[PDB]
Design a protein around this ligand. Structure first.
Ligand SMILES: Cc1cc2c(cc1C)N(C[C@H](O)[C@H](O)[C@H](O)COP(=O)(O)OP(=O)(O)OC[C@H]1O[C@@H](n3cnc4c(N)ncnc43)[C@H](O)[C@@H]1O)c1[nH]c(=O)[nH]c(=O)c1N2
Ligand SMILES: Cc1cc2c(cc1C)N(C[C@H](O)[C@H](O)[C@H](O)COP(=O)(O)OP(=O)(O)OC[C@H]1O[C@@H](n3cnc4c(N)ncnc43)[C@H](O)[C@@H]1O)c1[nH]c(=O)[nH]c(=O)c1N2
Ligand SMILES: [Cl-]
Ligand SMILES: [Cl-]
Ligand SMILES: [Cl-]
Ligand SMILES: [Hg+2]
Ligand SMILES: [Hg+2]
Ligand SMILES: [Hg+2]
Ligand SMILES: [Hg+2]
Ligand SMILES: [Hg+2]
Ligand SMILES: [Hg+2]
Ligand SMILES: [Hg+2]
Ligand SMILES: [Hg+2]
Ligand SMILES: [Hg+2]
Ligand SMILES: [Hg+2]
Ligand SMILES: [Hg+2]
Ligand SMILES: [Hg+2]
Ligand SMILES: [Sm+3]
Ligand SMILES: [Sm+3]
Ligand SMILES: [Sm+3]
Ligand SMILES: [Sm+3]
Ligand SMILES: [Sm+3]
Ligand SMILES: [Sm+3]
Ligand SMILES: [Sm+3]
Ligand SMILES: [Sm+3]
Ligand SMILES: [Sm+3]
Ligand SMILES: [Sm+3]
Ligand SMILES: [Sm+3]
Lengths: 407, 412
């Protein structure tokens, strides 16, 4: 049993646990935290690549200008940051240069035509085909969705480091975690644990029912063992896709909005020599019209690519066919991306990859209209798709729960 | 990119791997592609061997076999050059009064088996000295499944006689028992390597979700550990998975397969290693203790380690104990070990390392040795369909039949 139960040990659930444990208003209550995975962090996942190279299979960068709450958290938990170099396109193509002119020249038309789709909006510059080539050169295939409006896309573009240069956020700075964002997760977890909260990792919430003034949760361990938990206050710090698997009538009984998701894929490769130094590619990012889409060269340490939507599924399908075919395709697409023959690309010594079926999903926190369960996720904020959104939702979720306790 | 095969086997346990080996050896089957799925990242299923701390091979799943009862398993160990060793837990060195009394009771009651052998084991034994005495006797066998109302006296007599710790209760001492010198995982890997070298393709980490007939073949929907959906087309399908897994699919199990029903029980094993073999002072090495105590069955493996093995409610008890935290779980073992050994709690030290495994459906039970879908022709393979339900020998027997059933389909 517990007074307060949080389902989800991502940055959102851990942060709202920290807020509640700090509050002098509800001191002494027991706090129980569940997560279906054996480790906290959710879509924050830091790994060591072969030798001594820390890499981010999930969230990777932040901007102090856009994400003040996240910068504050990094400093609060004494987490060191380092410069994130992939904030400009050094070898801009013609279509990328033309994109900048189109974005700025069409920008005043956002006032009256901001609601139409981004593709249709950009088509005003030189027609459909030209718009496709320009939008493609930003490396985020989500921008082609018909639901994303022009003003919505301008906001999205202005938030990403590789392409911010085409917006009024072109002065924003970007950083990464020196040791990986896992260090921040573990910092919050240790503080929450030292304060007396109980963690039950490896238990998935299946269903919830109202039990008088509290709730009865049905969970299952990853070995199938069924567990029941009673709580007085419940926060679901899980993304919308996870809410759909529950029996809580999401989103109908929570808000008047709908939610969607897109897959994401990252692949990291190390080599015997930093061969890309010969092409002056260290600390540069290339956005290309081939399945790699976005290629990054981190100093002299490793390279990686990052894609979404259909290309993420393509690479995951490529992994399911075998490692040899997977690395072969990477080698082919690296060669064409660099404009050189395949034989000049070496073979890697080690590699790791990660596929997120719902890597990105889209009031800062929600409440069930009848039961009072609180829902916490970046998808409910103006920073959907960003760790900052989780912190904003967590602050609002803890505020909602404190009002529930004080009532 | 498209996934397709002539033959698909879902399940990389001993049953699925063996029927793959049979099919690859068949001359009337050469040239066909074979694809093998399993939801786990490693083959073996309920065979799971691990290294406890330094150098100590332990069996979190299947642990022992008898060459008298399980000749196909013995032959497989030999065929793949897997060395065996004596399984020492075959006698009760400290027979309790209730254990001695149950042997006498089952003997003296045996003339009543003809007329009353169909009633529950508990009710049958109750005819000796009443209900309470029967509970005490049956409890001392260490297998709580024997209390189930669906386990008849006739069934229990056979069950008692085929388990190493209590086989002496029905004078079945002629059964030798062996374990793997390096773990039964070595046998699994031996089969897998043979199957892989023969051309079969393994896709581990993919769980079958549903199956639909697709003309003369089948269309499979699978999901990887990361939620990625995989579609696979095959012509011939063997589901080498237990009944509980079959019931999770959309293949009308067991209605379209047999007239029998199927059940399961949970199992739990816990292993502990210490800085010294403290149990040697009590002459417990290579001995097993059966106790009216949540540990139920306590084993001491030479001077290497000890473990306990439980089923049914006590399996769930220890799993809930794990959920409370390692400290409370280890201290609960310490308390129950002291009570079982009749020694002071402080005399038992704390373990250096430990590991445990909970099998929600550790044993599955219920008539040919393999089944077929009366409409779609899908083949099912499991130890639960054999007279050796709950034993690896059953998987080997089911695989023989399943392979013959598929070869018939291929030749039709
Ligand atoms: C590849 C990639 C790249 C990026 C990013 C993501 C990904 C996948 N992000 C987004 C960022 O990772 C994201 O916004 C936050 O990590 C979300 O944190 P939450 O805790 O809200 O959800 P998150 O998904 O992290 O955690 C939810 C937790 O709930 C658990 N859970 C779900 N259902 C459950 C159930 N039924 N029972 C029990 N537990 C359950 C899950 O296991 C999970 O641990 C990012 N952001 C950013 O700021 N900068 C960046 O550069 C990027 N880049
Ligand atoms: C604790 C304990 C102790 C013992 C035993 C079990 C346990 C749990 N057994 C019984 C023995 O483990 C059992 O008889 C065989 O291992 C069963 O082999 P199968 O391959 O038939 O099923 P098994 O369950 O081993 O394998 C089935 C495989 O199918 C896979 N699968 C299931 N559904 C799937 C899906 N939808 N998609 C993809 N894959 C799927 C599973 O992941 C699994 O690998 C035993 N026997 C014995 O002879 N002597 C002994 O001492 C013991 N003791
Ligand atoms: Cl995901
Ligand atoms: Cl007596
Ligand atoms: Cl199981
Ligand atoms: Hg609290
Ligand atoms: Hg509190
Ligand atoms: Hg491939
Ligand atoms: Hg491929
Ligand atoms: Hg959103
Ligand atoms: Hg939260
Ligand atoms: Hg074959
Ligand atoms: Hg064959
Ligand atoms: Hg406990
Ligand atoms: Hg306990
Ligand atoms: Hg059976
Ligand atoms: Hg089989
Ligand atoms: Sm042009
Ligand atoms: Sm206008
Ligand atoms: Sm997901
Ligand atoms: Sm994004
Ligand atoms: Sm394929
Ligand atoms: Sm006696
Ligand atoms: Sm007596
Ligand atoms: Sm009579
Ligand atoms: Sm508890
Ligand atoms: Sm099971
Ligand atoms: Sm048994």
């Amino acid at each position: 049993s517990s007074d307060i139960c949080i389902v989800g040990a991502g940055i959102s659930g851990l942060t709202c646990a920290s807020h509640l444990l700090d509050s002098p208003a509800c001191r002494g209550l027991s706090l129980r935290i569940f997560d279906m995975q054996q480790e906290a962090g959710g879509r924050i996942r830091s790994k060591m690549l072969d030798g001594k190279a820390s890499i981010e299979l999930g969230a990777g960068r932040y901007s102090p200008q856009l994400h003040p709450h996240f910068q504050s958290a990094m400093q609060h938990y004494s987490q060191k940051s380092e410069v994130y170099p992939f904030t400009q396109l050094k070898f801009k193509s013609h279509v990328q240069q033309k994109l900048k002119r189109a974005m700025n020249e069409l920008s005043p038309r956002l006032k009256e035509h901001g609601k139409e789709s981004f593709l249709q909006f950009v088509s005003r510059y030189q027609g459909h085909d030209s718009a496709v080539g320009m939008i493609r050169s930003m490396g985020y295939d989500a921008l082609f969705l018909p639901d994303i409006s022009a003003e919505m896309a301008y906001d999205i573009v202005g938030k990403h480091p590789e392409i911010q240069s085409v917006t009024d956020n072109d002065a924003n700075q970007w950083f990464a975690a020196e040791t990986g964002f896992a260090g921040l997760i573990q910092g919050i977890k240790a503080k929450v644990k030292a304060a007396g909260a109980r963690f039950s990792l490896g238990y998935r919430l299946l269903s919830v029912r109202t039990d008088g003034d509290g709730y009865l949760l049905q969970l299952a361990g990853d070995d199938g063992w069924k567990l029941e938990h009673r709580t007085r206050h419940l926060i679901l710090a899980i993304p919308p896709s996870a809410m759909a698997g529950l029996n809580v009538d999401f989103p109908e009984a929570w808000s008047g909005a709908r939610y969607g998701s897109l897959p994401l894929f990252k692949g990291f490769l190390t080599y015997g020599e930093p061969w890309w130094l010969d092409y002056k590619l260290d600390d540069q990012v290339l956005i290309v019209d081939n399945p790699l889409r976005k290629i990054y060269f981190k100093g002299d340490k490793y390279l990686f690519f990052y894609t979404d939507s259909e290309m993420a599924n393509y690479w995951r399908g490529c992994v399911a066919e075998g490692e040899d075919g997977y690395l072969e395709q990477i080698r082919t697409h690296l060669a064409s991306a660099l404009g050189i023959v395949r034989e000049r690309i070496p073979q890697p010594l080690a590699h790791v990859h990660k596929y997120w079926a719902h890597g990105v999903e889209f009031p800062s926190a929600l409440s069930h209209r009848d039961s009072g369960i609180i829902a916490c996720s970046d998808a409910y904020t103006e920073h959907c798709g960003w760790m900052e959104g989780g912190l904003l939702s967590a602050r609002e979720a803890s505020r909602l729960l404190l009002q529930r306790i004080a009532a």
